[PDB]
């Protein structure tokens, strides 16, 4: 069930031979990459100077 | 005036009902085959249009 896409098509059904047609065999999602996003800037500096 | 068809639609039950959470999907299989039935019914409706 993870060799060829034809094998996955066979595995979605229960037949060793498949005729002409199109079948949804799996659903895919774009896995997000490793990155983050920022925060608003500092309003002022430290009250220590 | 006579309608002939509506917009074809398909719902991935697993992604819609769980989302990114892999554990929620790993718990869905206790229900057995509801997702397959829903997807098959939606596909049959879509090809009918």
Curated annotation (Swiss-Prot), chain A:
Attaches the virion to the cell membrane by interacting with host receptor, initiating the infection. The major receptor is host ACE2. When S2/S2' has been cleaved, binding to the receptor triggers direct fusion at the cell membrane. When S2/S2' has not been cleaved, binding to the receptor results in internalization of the virus by endocytosis using host TFRC and GRM2 and leading to fusion of the virion membrane with the host endosomal membrane. Alternatively, may use NRP1/NRP2 and integrin as entry receptors. The gene is S. This is Spike protein S1. Binds to host ACE2. RBD also interacts with the N-linked glycan on 'Asn-90' of ACE2. Cleavage of S generates a polybasic C-terminal sequence on S1 that binds to host Neuropilin-1 (NRP1) and Neuropilin-2 (NRP2) receptors. Interacts with host integrin alpha-5/beta-1 (ITGA5:ITGB1) and with ACE2 in complex with integrin alpha-5/beta-1 (ITGA5:ITGB1). May interact via cytoplasmic c-terminus with M protein. May interact (via N-terminus) with host bilirubin and biliverdin, thereby preventing antibody binding to the SARS-CoV-2 spike NTD via an allosteric mechanism. Residues 29-45 are annotated as: Disordered. It comes from the Viruses. Disulfide bonds join 1-11. Glycans are attached at residues 33, 35, 41. Changing residue 49 to H: In strain: Omicron/BA.2.75, Omicron/XBB.1.5, Omicron/EG.5.1.
């Amino acid at each position: 069930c993870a060799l060829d896409p034809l094998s996955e098509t066979k595995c979605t059904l229960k037949s060793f031979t498949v005729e002409k047609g199109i079948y949804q065999t799996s659903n895919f999602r774009v896995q997000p990459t490793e990155s983050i996003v920022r925060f608003p800037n500092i309003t002022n500096l430290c009250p220590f100077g | 005036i006579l309608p002939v068809s509506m917009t074809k639609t398909s719902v991935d039950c697993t992604m819609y009902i769980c989302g990114d959470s892999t554990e929620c999907s790993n718990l869905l299989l206790q229900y057995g085959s509801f997702c397959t039935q829903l997807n098959r019914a939606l596909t049959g409706i879509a090809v009918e249009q």
